[PDB]
RNA sequence: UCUACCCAUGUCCAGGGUGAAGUUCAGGUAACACUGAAUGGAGGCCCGAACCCACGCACGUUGAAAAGUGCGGGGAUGAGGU
RNA sequence: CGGGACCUAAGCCGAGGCCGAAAGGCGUAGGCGAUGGACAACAGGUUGAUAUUCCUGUACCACCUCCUCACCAUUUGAGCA
RNA sequence: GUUUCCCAUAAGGCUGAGCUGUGAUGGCGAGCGAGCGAAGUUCCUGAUUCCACACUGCCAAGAAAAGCCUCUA
RNA sequence: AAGGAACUCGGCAAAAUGACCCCGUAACUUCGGGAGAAGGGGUGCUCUGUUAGGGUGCAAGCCCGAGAGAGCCGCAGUGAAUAGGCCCAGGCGACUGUUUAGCAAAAACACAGGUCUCUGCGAAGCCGUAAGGCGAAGUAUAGGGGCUGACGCCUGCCCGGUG
RNA sequence: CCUAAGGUAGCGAAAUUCCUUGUCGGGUAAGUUCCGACCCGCACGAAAGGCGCAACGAUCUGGGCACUGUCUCAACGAGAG
RNA sequence: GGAGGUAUG
RNA sequence: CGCAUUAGCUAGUUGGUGAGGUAACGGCUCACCAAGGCGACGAUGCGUAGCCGACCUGAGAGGGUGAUCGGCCACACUGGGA
RNA sequence: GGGCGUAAAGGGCUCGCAGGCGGUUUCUUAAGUCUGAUGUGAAAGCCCCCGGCUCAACCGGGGAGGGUCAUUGGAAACUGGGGAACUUGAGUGCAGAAGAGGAGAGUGGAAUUCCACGUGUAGCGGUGAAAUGCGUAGAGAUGUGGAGGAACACCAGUGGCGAAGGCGACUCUCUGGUCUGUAACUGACGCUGAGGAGCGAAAGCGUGGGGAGCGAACAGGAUUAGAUACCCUGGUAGUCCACGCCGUAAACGAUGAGUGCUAAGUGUUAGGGGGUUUCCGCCCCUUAGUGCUGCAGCUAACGCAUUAAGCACUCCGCCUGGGGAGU
RNA sequence: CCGAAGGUGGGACAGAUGAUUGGGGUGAAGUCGUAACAAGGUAGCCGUAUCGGAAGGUGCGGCUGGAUCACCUCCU
């Protein structure tokens, strides 16, 4: 994940000017990493070590989504639409 | 001009059943896998006429016939019949 | 209509040619050779005996010009091929 | 035949079973009696025939030559 | 009739089963099968009824058409004809196929698969005296020959003799 | 002691076992056949393959059910001689 | 001065 | 109470409408509708057992027993029926 | 009211659904929790106190006692539910650091073997001693070049990285994680985790490649009473590669994961800050790993000891004498 | 209509028995070797594969729960 792409994501999803810690922001960064990493694994199918990194990312994302849904259901629903998640 | 194989070019195989691969959809997953439906229409596939074959029995045995007839039988999209 | 004055497959024959005691065997060009390709007519009527064949009606194909009309062109000149 | 550019998702074409008109002021026609002669439509069903090896799929990878069209010599 | 394989080398022959619909279906398996396993049930006609629904058509009207309920008749309703008998277990061959035209259809041949071996291309091999051919308009992932015969697990020892 | 080396796995009274209807178990009232074991393999054996094996078979073999003129045991009727 | 590694009865 | 070397079970099953039936509510039964109900907080299945007051044991928590006496339940050769 | 370093006992390792457990302040609620009253827990029996059988057993009278019980009030510290805050846990941003972490594609040098050639001659090889074996058909030794496969000397270090298995030539592509500082942001979002999913040395298996060295099996020479072994000369599978399967190890630290607390000394790895400075460096401090020694404490002992086997709390796994049997 | 028993059929479950067969346990003195315990005389053990009368041998990988002697670090 390049730095300019990351700046796009954080600005697009941040809840306010200085916000970088919000669930929304974190889930956006993770979602790109997860998608980006999936593409790498499609070619390097046997890279089991890297894949373990993906599994932690997937767990982190689920926990942030679970937190958001329980905190404020509205915010949660908006985010999964913008990101196109099935959750 | 029988018959064996081959070569070239034709032609024949009523009907019914089963439902391969592939594909689509739905569910499912982080993704895949996986699951269920539908579509699809494979096969020296199944059942069964024509056609080809000839397993059993009876009869015929100076025969209707120098190899047949009757009742059943086997294959019947194939290495098929002609 | 089916076959020949059309085409070719398998195969057969084969000018020269190659090979072989002889007889002959093989084979190039070129031919032959349907079971295939190409190809213009249908309905009705009729005899004791034939019928897309004869008769009635209406067609179609190829070719020919004593003729008629239309158009084009006569040496980069139509047209045929 | 091949290559590069330009248009277009339409144009055009090549085909095509059949259907309608005409052929037909004709023929045929139950039947009547060589001759005479009515109605002669629609609906349903429907091919193993045709469009057509068209489409789809498959592997075992599915004649030739002439007719025919064209190109110059 | 009664019996029901007591017949016989042997259930030979005959009998029995047979169509459609519904329920249901084992061991085992190469997961496809076995399987129509097996074992049962229903079936006629009449009225609800040009039915629920479907095809065709502008509509009438034509066809197709389950399922039920309610009745009626007979010994019996695929009322006739045509239409698998089934199950258990073992031997052999895996299989479809082929074979002694006219006494043998099989366990025999073939087979996909396995392996060995020859063959560098004018290939080896084969036909012919030769030319000329097949191989092959192919080229070692190809072609010829020997043996084995799907698939699964395997395929031991001996090179003295013969090749 | 001999040989080149002395048969392994698996299977075995077998399409192979003469003795033999081997012995044992099952199936029958009674089973020289059949099935399951055993192993003294007359004379199995690993590509003239060994041992298994679903599916297949007008194959060979044994047992059940249905069914019956096959039979006990024959009778009647039809047609053709 | 101590740890770790490099034949019968 | 035991067993997961028992994980899915259920189809009057789970609700609704109506009717019937009962001393009486109720799928208790039927007809017609919908697809629901139970289950890892152990359904289902298998095995085992009458339950309890109490009795034996133990410092107690517990463990074992459920004879005699009392309460409740179930049964009367086996199955069903009124 | 027990344990799991060595006595039986920590899953090979990670990810993770359900479940269990959960930081600080305040308000609220009253499910858990505590409490008042009321109701109920038959008789016999057990216990306490009386009385009658000549005593005792036994019999009788009066009480006591007994529940995660129900109805109805109250309290609000803790647990649970709801709301609002907080930042330490956890994570994000921003700035740095190291690393055999992984996958893919290339490249390089040494050495073994083989092939060709020059020089060159009688042994070479091997053992405890020999022989089998190779060599006059020119071996071994030696020089040049070439082919091919596998592994990466020195660096290299109780050094690094990874969850574990494991990872060590160089270059490039893709890619995971950890550590340090910062306080810019979210504000408990966390821990563990049966079942489940993924990974998991070596051997082994299937298909197809590749095959130098090594080498189960096997052959031969020795050794030996025998030698189906050790030793020697050969040598097949395998070791290697792609895909798939297998899912086991003394998979070990024989030590589950998370968190916090509890003397020091001393190496070493990657950072940060500072102290005299151009620096170098020395010294000081600080994190996070990795070793040794060693208090308190623990242990049957051996030993562990801020990397606990100490003191605690949460969750998971597992043990209950040895064989039979991991059948 | 409902309906016990009974009948037919194919499965499920549980037990008993069975030719024959496989290891296992236990036994006063059997036979063959000697695998382990010391460096057990080839260190042992673990997983796996293969081989062998038998313990066992060998290969690949792993462990120290390995003896003896050399060398590099750590600690006293
Ligand atoms: Mg067929
Ligand atoms: Mg047939
Ligand atoms: Mg004929
Ligand atoms: Mg012709
Ligand atoms: Mg008899
Ligand atoms: Mg008799
Ligand atoms: Mg018969
Ligand atoms: Mg056969
Ligand atoms: Mg056949
Ligand atoms: Mg014959
Ligand atoms: Mg015959
Ligand atoms: Mg044969
Ligand atoms: Mg052999
Ligand atoms: Mg033989
Ligand atoms: Mg042989
Ligand atoms: Mg054979």
Short mmCIF file of C-alpha atoms (C1' of nucleotides) in Angstrom, two decimals, chain E residues 1-7 11-13 15-16 28-30 33-34 85-96 106-107 114 147-158 160, chain F residues 3-9 14-16 29-30 34-36 45-74:
data_model
loop_
_atom_site.label_atom_id
_atom_site.label_comp_id
_atom_site.label_asym_id
_atom_site.label_seq_id
_atom_site.Cartn_x
_atom_site.Cartn_y
_atom_site.Cartn_z
"C1'" A E 1 -58.51 -82.70 -9.16
"C1'" A E 2 -54.56 -83.32 -4.72
"C1'" G E 3 -49.43 -82.53 -4.49
"C1'" G E 4 -45.65 -78.99 -6.21
"C1'" A E 5 -39.12 -80.67 -8.82
"C1'" A E 6 -40.86 -86.08 -5.66
"C1'" C E 7 -38.79 -85.48 -12.76
"C1'" G E 11 -36.15 -77.06 -13.22
"C1'" C E 12 -34.65 -79.45 -20.16
"C1'" A E 13 -39.36 -77.84 -21.52
"C1'" A E 15 -45.45 -72.44 -16.29
"C1'" A E 16 -45.01 -68.05 -13.67
"C1'" C E 28 -20.74 -54.13 -1.90
"C1'" U E 29 -18.36 -50.28 -4.93
"C1'" U E 30 -13.60 -48.26 -9.15
"C1'" G E 33 -23.10 -47.88 -10.16
"C1'" G E 34 -25.54 -52.18 -8.00
"C1'" G E 85 -39.21 -63.94 -13.09
"C1'" C E 86 -36.43 -62.72 -8.73
"C1'" C E 87 -32.81 -63.55 -4.75
"C1'" C E 88 -28.23 -65.64 -2.36
"C1'" A E 89 -23.14 -67.61 -3.12
"C1'" G E 90 -18.82 -69.29 -5.77
"C1'" G E 91 -15.16 -70.37 -10.47
"C1'" C E 92 -13.34 -67.92 -15.07
"C1'" G E 93 -12.81 -63.70 -18.20
"C1'" A E 94 -12.36 -56.94 -16.30
"C1'" C E 95 -15.75 -54.57 -19.69
"C1'" U E 96 -18.70 -53.54 -25.37
"C1'" A E 106 -16.56 -70.32 -24.53
"C1'" A E 107 -12.67 -69.54 -19.63
"C1'" G E 114 2.02 -52.79 -18.68
"C1'" C E 147 5.08 -61.44 -24.28
"C1'" U E 148 1.19 -59.76 -20.59
"C1'" G E 149 -3.91 -58.22 -20.59
"C1'" A E 150 -8.99 -53.03 -17.23
"C1'" C E 151 -8.35 -51.42 -12.16
"C1'" G E 152 -5.93 -52.22 -6.84
"C1'" C E 153 -1.48 -54.35 -4.10
"C1'" C E 154 2.71 -56.52 -5.98
"C1'" U E 155 6.01 -59.03 -9.39
"C1'" G E 156 11.12 -62.76 -5.05
"C1'" C E 157 16.11 -66.03 -6.02
"C1'" C E 158 19.44 -67.99 -10.26
"C1'" G E 160 25.92 -72.48 -14.67
"C1'" U F 3 23.94 -76.54 -7.28
"C1'" A F 4 23.92 -71.23 -11.28
"C1'" A F 5 20.36 -70.91 -7.35
"C1'" G F 6 17.65 -73.88 -4.23
"C1'" G F 7 10.27 -71.19 -4.47
"C1'" U F 8 9.97 -65.35 -1.29
"C1'" A F 9 5.07 -62.61 -0.90
"C1'" A F 14 -7.88 -75.37 -6.64
"C1'" A F 15 -10.38 -75.14 -14.46
"C1'" U F 16 -4.35 -77.40 -10.59
"C1'" A F 29 -34.49 -86.13 6.83
"C1'" A F 30 -30.50 -87.99 3.81
"C1'" C F 34 -21.59 -76.75 -3.34
"C1'" C F 35 -19.75 -73.08 0.50
"C1'" G F 36 -15.97 -71.84 4.90
"C1'" G F 45 3.47 -69.24 -7.50
"C1'" A F 46 4.63 -64.10 -9.09
"C1'" A F 47 4.13 -60.46 -16.88
"C1'" A F 48 3.18 -68.62 -20.96
"C1'" G F 49 2.22 -62.91 -14.47
"C1'" G F 50 0.68 -63.92 -8.40
"C1'" C F 51 -3.30 -62.35 -5.22
"C1'" G F 52 -7.71 -59.39 -4.93
"C1'" C F 53 -11.73 -57.11 -7.50
"C1'" A F 54 -17.17 -53.04 -8.32
"C1'" A F 55 -19.60 -53.40 -13.07
"C1'" C F 56 -20.53 -56.89 -17.02
"C1'" G F 57 -21.85 -62.48 -19.16
"C1'" A F 58 -27.66 -66.54 -24.09
"C1'" U F 59 -20.30 -68.33 -19.46
"C1'" C F 60 -19.61 -72.72 -15.66
"C1'" U F 61 -21.43 -74.07 -10.53
"C1'" G F 62 -24.48 -74.77 -5.78
"C1'" G F 63 -28.76 -73.08 -2.87
"C1'" G F 64 -33.66 -70.54 -1.98
"C1'" C F 65 -38.57 -68.15 -3.53
"C1'" A F 66 -42.46 -67.84 -7.36
"C1'" C F 67 -44.31 -71.34 -10.66
"C1'" U F 68 -46.03 -75.04 -12.79
"C1'" G F 69 -48.30 -82.01 -16.57
"C1'" U F 70 -41.15 -82.27 -15.27
"C1'" C F 71 -43.04 -85.89 -12.16
"C1'" U F 72 -46.68 -89.17 -8.72
"C1'" C F 73 -50.09 -90.70 -13.14
"C1'" A F 74 -52.27 -89.92 -16.39
#
